[PDB]
Amino acid sequence: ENLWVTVYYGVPVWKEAKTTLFCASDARAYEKEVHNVWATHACVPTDPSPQELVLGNVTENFNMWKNDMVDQMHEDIISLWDQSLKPCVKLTPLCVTLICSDAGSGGVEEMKNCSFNTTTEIRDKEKKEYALFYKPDIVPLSETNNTSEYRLINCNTSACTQACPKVTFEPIPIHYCAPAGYAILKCNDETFNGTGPCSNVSTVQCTHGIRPVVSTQLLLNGSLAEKEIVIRSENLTNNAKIIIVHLHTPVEIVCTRPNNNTRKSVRIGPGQTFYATGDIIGDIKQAHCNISEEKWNDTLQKVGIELQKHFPNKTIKYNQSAGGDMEITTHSFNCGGEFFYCNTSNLFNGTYNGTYISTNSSANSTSTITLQCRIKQIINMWQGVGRCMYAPPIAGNITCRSNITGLLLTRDGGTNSNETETFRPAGGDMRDNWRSELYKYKVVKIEPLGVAPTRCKRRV
């Protein structure tokens, strides 16, 4: 009849909290003798059995535009990029005035020759060297129309750090694990619009594999969706918030290149040797990307038929990116250590007015979309705090038979009496990639102590 306090160890209650997180790689990356810019040895190996448990009758609130795991991933990748360039060759002597002409006989319309002078093993004497530099890396310092003088582009802001030519930029998967005494709530609802309640919450220690690919528009390799094309956005009222389209089926994409000679080893000091592009053997062709026609057309048509839920009585259009410099408006990625920047006018040239147009032609698979596109070497990513990288070139031809997962769209500022709201592509900050991978997860703290009244009383 009386009530007494009783303690319980094992009470399942949660608190919203933030904590530092692990890294869980696999054993297959543990055996390689080369170290990539991420970690293989530093991460703890994971057990080959993901313990997943489903909760009975819980409904949990979820958010992803205010998350902590996204910021921790962003800080981890920034710190790894700034840490993998410490024992590397600093190309501070590559700031000399460069004398450049056409690229030999039969000009390539991509590269300049740009022969400079450099310091030999004696501080006094100098020797003449030649290289090949890409056009976006070269800027004509001038006071007149003197077209014979040029300089390197990163001898104006900061940095001048060369990447170490034994690491790889390959995106191996990394798992995130919470420490002991914490857990991760993962929402398995297929129609998750980004915020709000979820009703199939599962408790997971170590998240699934995340590939840290880098892409401004047009998301590369990643986890697919479950049932249909899904729209994620913060508000869908203002046009400043980047809208993320997540696809159900992938579209193949390939990107290739003509030949180069090799790394031409140029020595600039005691034990400091950088590898600029030497000769080019073979003819000169343009680097490009290839996408199948009908796959892209009906993928964008599926995005059209699903995107009309939030805009019921309006037609949708697409056009190019809305101006700026080349580093933001273009689809940028890396393959084999070479950085590609690509013009995407041919992909976003179309509209939908509500009439679905089915296609049935098995002999019309020859039609493809090409993308005429360029290659830089001096890299200025993360729009700052970047430690500007000079990626050394790669001798043979390179092929990037990739996969596609998502799109990063934005809405143009609409006008009155309009039924033709257009959607452009946009890049921006790199938080959107890992926000489009970590929509499922939320880190949480368990409190295993509880108190409750009951009829039990301790003996005296």
Binding site: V7, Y9, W14, C23, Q51, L55, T454, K457
Partner: protein
């Protein structure tokens, strides 16, 4: 079965599954984060065991005490509490007074053990 196996079930069903919940408590740039996480895991486990060990409930999943339950904390009968609530909401209206609960339990343990010492020294 592992963590949080009855996280949305009723309060009375949670008492029969406590043996499986409190099991996993110890089992460059990616070394320092691992070290900080390991240190805070050790700190969390030691804090929970120390707080369980002050008021005479060490090594027990369910421990009964001898402090009366004031009606100004819950003011609700036993039946609907033990058959209607989940643990989450009950923790929400006890979290305002858990400090007073902890202090009363600590003082009750000290009084009980001093009474035990006097009873043992009587002989």
């Amino acid at each position: 079965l592992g963590f949080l196996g009855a996280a949305g079930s009723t309060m009375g069903a949670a008492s029969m599954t406590l043996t499986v919940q409190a099991r996993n408590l110890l089992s460059t740039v990616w070394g320092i984060k691992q070290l900080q996480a390991r240190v805070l895991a050790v700190e969390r486990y030691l804090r929970d065991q120390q707080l369980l060990g002050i008021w005479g409930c060490s090594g027990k999943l369910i421990c009964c005490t001898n402090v009366p339950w004031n009606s100004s904390w819950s003011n609700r009968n036993l039946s609907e509490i033990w058959d209607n609530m989940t643990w989450l909401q009950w923790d929400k209206e006890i979290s305002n007074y858990t400090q007073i609960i902890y202090g009363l339990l600590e003082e009750s343990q000290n009084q009980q053990e001093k009474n035990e010492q006097d009873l043992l020294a009587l002989d």
